[PDB]
């Protein structure tokens, strides 16, 4: 059919500042059973309707996957502002695809704290839609310059999550798949 197990059932997800991007093409995808039978925590479509995605088809489909905070799923949506929206993953105001998210406290959470996942905390300006910043270098706060090392007003841009099972649903990890939308017809 179409590689949706490779996206939704992948063993490891990428950090939000380094979200994956898989092109979906030359396949027949049955979104109807995915919506109706798969019990996700969130399935929101903005430019389309989930129950009639099959009759439409597109030149290409993109699937983006990343792990974010529990209450940080709010800003995965068009027109949203927040740490992820400005600095990690910006979504277009005219976004036409769907956003899928589910709780992953059973996989991405550790007792010692899962420092495996990072999120960009400081940046010079807001991101363009569908643009990501891989390079990490010390961020200059204030007006004094930076010698390339952390210091008083020089910060490491990437702040790590510390997922623990007792953090609460607000801070528990959430695995998010963002779908962007005639080679893929239902």
């Amino acid at each position, epitope marked *: 059919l179409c590689p949706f197990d490779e996206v939704f059932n992948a063993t490891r997800f990428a950090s939000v500042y380094a979200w994956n991007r898989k092109r979906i093409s030359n396949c027949v995808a049955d979104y109807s059973v995915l919506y109706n039978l798969a019990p996700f*925590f*969130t399935f929101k479509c903005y430019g389309v309707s989930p129950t009639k995605l099959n009759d439409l088809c597109f030149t290409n489909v993109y699937a983006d996957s990343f792990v974010i905070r529990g209450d940080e799923v709010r800003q995965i949506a068009p027109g949203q502002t927040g740490n992820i929206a400005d600095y990690n993953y910006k979504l277009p105001d005219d976004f036409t695809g769907c956003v899928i998210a589910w709780n992953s406290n059973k996989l991405d959470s550790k007792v010692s704290g899962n420092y495996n996942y990072l999120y960009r905390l400081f940046r010079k300006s807001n991101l363009k839609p569908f643009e990501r910043d891989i390079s990490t270098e010390i961020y200059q706060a204030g007006n004094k310059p930076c010698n390339g090392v952390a210091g008083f007003n020089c910060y490491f841009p990437l702040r790590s999550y510390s997922f623990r099972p007792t953090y609460g649903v607000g801070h528990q990890p959430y695995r998010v798949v963002v779908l962007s939308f005639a080679t893929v017809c239902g």
Partner: antibody
Amino acid sequence: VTLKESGPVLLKPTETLTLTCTVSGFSLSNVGMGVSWIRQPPGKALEWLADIFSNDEKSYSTSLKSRLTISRDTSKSQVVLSMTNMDPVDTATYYCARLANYDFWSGYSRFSAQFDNWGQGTLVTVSS
Amino acid sequence: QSVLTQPPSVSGAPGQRVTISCTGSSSNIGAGYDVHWYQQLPGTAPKLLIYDNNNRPSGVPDRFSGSKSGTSASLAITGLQAEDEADYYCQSFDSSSLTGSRVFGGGTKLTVL
């Protein structure tokens, strides 16, 4: 869509209450909605109690999580709520509501779900 | 007590604007969660009135509107008719627990003078 609770019941203190909701117009197996229970003391504000969804994920009030217990039965379309160690202060009108997303044509999100449909409620009285 | 707080009662003359406020904590409303408004007429079950910030269900008159700003949200009624005399409840999702929670407001009693 129609939700109906069980009949009113009077209980002694320290007893265990059991309330059942029968739903119609939608299936509990649908992933887009769940069923939740809300209680309202006479002349007081509403209080959310419990929550259950399609895949048996369950949530409870933090202060009452120990006393509460909820379950569902898709074959006969009912959700059962049980409360242990009933106190006289717990007398209230118990409402049964559907946790579904209005604007359903846009999808669903369990964070933004709201009690879009409510039952008529039942009166639970706790006294000697 | 409830996590969300509302003024206990508000009053207004017919045909005049009335606003009811609702404030939250660092979680729930402060965490970006939506705010829903319900109407409870005397001797009746609550009815959904504002299903999302500034979003309105079908059948609810245009004179009802809502907004959210920071850790507070409000409900605004442009006119004031006879039937606008019920209790209005603020509601939002609270994420400060292991499985999440849903918090109601204290309820505001609206009266028409």
